[PDB]
Design a protein around this motif. Structure first.
Motif, PDB file in Angstrom:
ATOM      1  N   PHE A 237      38.063  38.108  45.515  1.00 16.23           N
ATOM      2  CA  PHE A 237      39.560  37.899  45.698  1.00 16.23           C
ATOM      3  C   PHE A 237      40.074  38.865  46.859  1.00 16.23           C
ATOM      4  O   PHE A 237      39.485  40.014  46.778  1.00 16.23           O
ATOM      5  CB  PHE A 237      40.010  37.823  44.600  1.00 16.23           C
ATOM      6  CG  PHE A 237      39.502  36.647  43.604  1.00 16.23           C
ATOM      7  CD1 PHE A 237      39.462  35.497  43.841  1.00 16.23           C
ATOM      8  CD2 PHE A 237      38.746  37.211  42.486  1.00 16.23           C
ATOM      9  CE1 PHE A 237      38.982  34.396  43.076  1.00 16.23           C
ATOM     10  CE2 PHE A 237      38.205  36.241  41.778  1.00 16.23           C
ATOM     11  CZ  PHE A 237      37.973  34.948  41.960  1.00 16.23           C
TER      12      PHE A 237
ATOM     13  N   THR B 221      36.807  36.240  37.237  1.00 17.63           N
ATOM     14  CA  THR B 221      38.127  36.094  37.050  1.00 17.63           C
ATOM     15  C   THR B 221      38.225  36.567  35.677  1.00 17.63           C
ATOM     16  O   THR B 221      37.318  36.606  34.779  1.00 17.63           O
ATOM     17  CB  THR B 221      38.565  34.639  37.203  1.00 17.63           C
ATOM     18  OG1 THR B 221      37.806  33.787  36.452  1.00 17.63           O
ATOM     19  CG2 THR B 221      38.158  34.067  38.750  1.00 17.63           C
TER      20      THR B 221
ATOM     21  N   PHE C 185      38.662  44.727  43.980  1.00 13.07           N
ATOM     22  CA  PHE C 185      38.680  43.566  43.277  1.00 13.07           C
ATOM     23  C   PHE C 185      37.292  43.217  42.646  1.00 13.07           C
ATOM     24  O   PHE C 185      36.070  43.394  43.306  1.00 13.07           O
ATOM     25  CB  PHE C 185      38.907  42.594  43.928  1.00 13.07           C
ATOM     26  CG  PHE C 185      40.730  42.210  44.351  1.00 13.07           C
ATOM     27  CD1 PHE C 185      41.020  41.205  43.187  1.00 13.07           C
ATOM     28  CD2 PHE C 185      41.314  42.818  45.297  1.00 13.07           C
ATOM     29  CE1 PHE C 185      42.839  41.150  43.409  1.00 13.07           C
ATOM     30  CE2 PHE C 185      42.768  42.418  45.287  1.00 13.07           C
ATOM     31  CZ  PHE C 185      43.275  41.778  44.178  1.00 13.07           C
ATOM     32  N   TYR C 186      37.335  42.632  41.429  1.00 11.68           N
ATOM     33  CA  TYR C 186      36.269  41.992  41.048  1.00 11.68           C
ATOM     34  C   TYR C 186      36.247  40.735  41.504  1.00 11.68           C
ATOM     35  O   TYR C 186      37.341  39.788  41.748  1.00 11.68           O
ATOM     36  CB  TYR C 186      36.306  41.881  39.588  1.00 11.68           C
ATOM     37  CG  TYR C 186      36.386  43.170  38.741  1.00 11.68           C
ATOM     38  CD1 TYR C 186      35.156  43.673  38.350  1.00 11.68           C
ATOM     39  CD2 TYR C 186      37.479  43.869  38.368  1.00 11.68           C
ATOM     40  CE1 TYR C 186      35.147  44.799  37.472  1.00 11.68           C
ATOM     41  CE2 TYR C 186      37.386  45.018  37.629  1.00 11.68           C
ATOM     42  CZ  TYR C 186      36.153  45.456  37.091  1.00 11.68           C
ATOM     43  OH  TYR C 186      36.171  46.553  36.411  1.00 11.68           O
ATOM     44  N   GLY C 187      34.961  40.242  42.052  1.00  5.62           N
ATOM     45  CA  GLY C 187      34.650  38.979  42.825  1.00  5.62           C
ATOM     46  C   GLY C 187      35.066  39.183  44.192  1.00  5.62           C
ATOM     47  O   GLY C 187      35.641  40.038  44.749  1.00  5.62           O
TER      48      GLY C 187
ATOM     49  N   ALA D  38      37.819  30.318  42.751  1.00  2.41           N
ATOM     50  CA  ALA D  38      37.401  31.294  41.905  1.00  2.41           C
ATOM     51  C   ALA D  38      35.870  30.959  41.627  1.00  2.41           C
ATOM     52  O   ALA D  38      35.114  32.117  41.481  1.00  2.41           O
ATOM     53  CB  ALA D  38      37.960  30.728  40.439  1.00  2.41           C
TER      54      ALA D  38
ATOM     55  N   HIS E  34      43.090  34.816  36.556  1.00  7.07           N
ATOM     56  CA  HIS E  34      43.697  35.862  36.887  1.00  7.07           C
ATOM     57  C   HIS E  34      42.546  36.746  37.714  1.00  7.07           C
ATOM     58  O   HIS E  34      41.365  36.648  37.379  1.00  7.07           O
ATOM     59  CB  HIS E  34      44.468  36.701  35.804  1.00  7.07           C
ATOM     60  CG  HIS E  34      45.353  36.095  35.222  1.00  7.07           C
ATOM     61  ND1 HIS E  34      45.094  35.327  33.895  1.00  7.07           N
ATOM     62  CD2 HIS E  34      46.615  35.336  35.773  1.00  7.07           C
ATOM     63  CE1 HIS E  34      46.553  34.526  33.770  1.00  7.07           C
ATOM     64  NE2 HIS E  34      47.160  34.454  34.769  1.00  7.07           N
ATOM     65  N   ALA E  35      43.007  37.488  38.643  1.00  9.79           N
ATOM     66  CA  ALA E  35      42.064  38.348  39.479  1.00  9.79           C
ATOM     67  C   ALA E  35      42.683  39.624  39.725  1.00  9.79           C
ATOM     68  O   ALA E  35      44.010  39.756  39.774  1.00  9.79           O
ATOM     69  CB  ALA E  35      41.888  37.619  40.776  1.00  9.79           C
TER      70      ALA E  35
END
Ligand SMILES: O=C(Cc1cccc(Cl)c1)Nc1cncc2cnccc12
Ligand SMILES: O=C(Cc1cccc(Cl)c1)Nc1cncc2cnccc12
Lengths: 304, 304
Positions: free
Chosen positions: A185, A135, A181-183, A194, A172-173
């Motif tokens: 999400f 995030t 996407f990072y992560g 998160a 934030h995502a």
């Protein structure tokens, strides 16, 4: 002297920002060459944001449904495609202000500047980091989607982030510029975990070296530690484990100050175990982790 | 949501930065229309920086001694004059990238963005405030002189600061764009007293309203106070006295949150008297004073 949370000059990125509208939704887009990059949720209404089938939704859209405005002038859309969570709108004109650029996927712990935009217009610039939980702790209001994160090396802009979402926790995502996407999400209006956000240990050590370089030395102690002893403390305080790779990157800062990396680790161990006792380091009453070793060297050397 | 130390997008200012060299000294200049503005100490050698007679030194200089470079292209100097502590070099070409601009002298407590530059090239951007003692806590290395501070309203850049000096304490002193130093500082290599630096009370209250707006509410208490009771506490903690003018500017934030200004003052009084007890507000373990009420509203509303 002095140490600040410094962002890259945003001019090169400002020249790429455009406004993308689809139906009743308006967000930001990034115009590089003859392509405009934007979050694919631009095709959604609030109703289908609950469970969107982006492929089925994009079928109802044509090139003429994507309104792209650069300043006050309209761009002609001659192609549209979806790559992961981003839409690529091919326009008939190459951005005359396109800087030298690359798309890079950053690692957690790395920092970048964000040019927050609304309606294709830049509002401000700030520095932030990709958190270990993927995030970012940004500052974004409705309409900020499509705002990008970047780094600059001499004349080359390395775009690393595109803002898509705010989690119910206020963090934030987003994606890289390939729409991944990072992560974990997803681009859906559903509550998403998160994950535990740990402290970026190598960055705190870099900021401690920055403090010594700029005169703040009260925290320097008569102790040393080992990587394994230090990591026991780091685990206890939800800090990322420090590896020899991290020690290697702290080499130039260790050479600049004459303070061995493990000696600086012992200073950090004591700060973690004892707190700051009401004192400050570089105008901060907590340990700062959003400056990488590269950032500290760049700021303390003057790279333009 | 989220709250960051946000700077204005620096593009409009980047297009004005140039390199000015005189003799063996190189610093930054600001090219607006057909004039280049730079610190007058560009005409000095390290030897005469001890006690310079700028008028006598400028007599030994001609238009051809001032080398002005914009990117890689040389500007032809057709005039030179000294206005207070700045030199105005008239060039034969108007800067095609000159934005709409004004020169403004800011009040202490006001904030501005700084585009740190070296050799006429921008390195980074950060937000800072004019301290009550008329210093700024910047981040500047040798060669940064001539870097400017500014604010942006829609398309207009209000230049407010030009960097000239670093005090032996590591804090920074400079002028407005008419060459008048903020504070008692002179452009001489002599130790100069900065003065007591108090906390900008109205800005801390604005940041406390920013915290409530973004969800951090732990510090809100069941108390109220009066301006006179609050100012007794402010004096004790080296905070600027709060006046009805300050209360008036906090009106929009008070209306946004429904928290009366004097109630927020009572929260601040308790935070000053009790500390944070190891807690944070907007990711900070100290009371932040470099966000004005205007900044908080702008960031929390999305002005572009
Ligand atoms: O989060 C969303 C919309 C959304 C919803 C579900 C999924 C996706 Cl991909 C996007 N937009 C915002 C981004 N950042 C900050 C905001 C602040 N206020 C409102 C809205 C914001
Ligand atoms: O302070 C000076 C030179 C100077 C000396 C006396 C008077 C005047 Cl007007 C200017 N230049 C610097 C500015 N900011 C930051 C620095 C950091 N390191 C070195 C030098 C710096």
């Amino acid at each position: 002297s002095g140490f600040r949370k410094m962002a890259f000059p945003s001019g090169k990125v400002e020249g790429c920002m455009v406004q993308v509208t689809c139906g009743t939704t308006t967000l930001n887009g990034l115009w590089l060459d003859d392509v405009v990059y934007c979050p694919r949720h631009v095709i959604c209404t609030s109703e289908d944001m609950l469970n969107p089938n982006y492929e089925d939704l994009l079928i109802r859209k044509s090139n003429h449904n994507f309104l792209v405005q650069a300043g006050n002038v309209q761009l002609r859309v001659i192609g549209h495609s979806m790559q992961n969570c981003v839409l690529k709108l091919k326009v008939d004109t190459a951005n005359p202000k396109t800087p030298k650029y690359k798309f890079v996927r950053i690692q957690p712990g790395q920092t970048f500047s964000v040019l927050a935009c609304y309606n294709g217009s830049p509002s401000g610039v700030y520095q932030c980091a990709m958190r270990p939980n993927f995030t970012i702790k940004g500052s974004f209001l409705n309409g900020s989607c499509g705002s990008v994160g970047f780094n600059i090396d001499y004349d080359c802009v390395s775009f690393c982030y595109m803002h898509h979402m705010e989690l119910p926790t206020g963090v934030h995502a987003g994606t890289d510029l390939e729409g991944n996407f990072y992560g974990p999400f997803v681009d859906r209006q559903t509550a998403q975990a998160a994950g535990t956000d740990t402290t970026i240990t190598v960055n705190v050590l870099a900021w401690l070296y920055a403090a010594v370089i700029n005169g703040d030395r009260w925290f320097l102690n008569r102790f040393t530690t080992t990587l394994n002893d230090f990591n026991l403390v780091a685990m206890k305080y939800n800090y990322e484990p420090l590896t020899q790779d991290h020690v290697d990157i702290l080499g130039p800062l260790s050479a600049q100050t004459g303070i061995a990396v493990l000696d600086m680790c012992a200073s950090l161990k004591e700060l973690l175990q004892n707190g700051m006792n009401g004192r400050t380091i570089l105008g901060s009453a907590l340990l700062e982790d959003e400056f990488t070793p590269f950032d500290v060297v760049r700021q303390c050397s003057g790279v333009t």
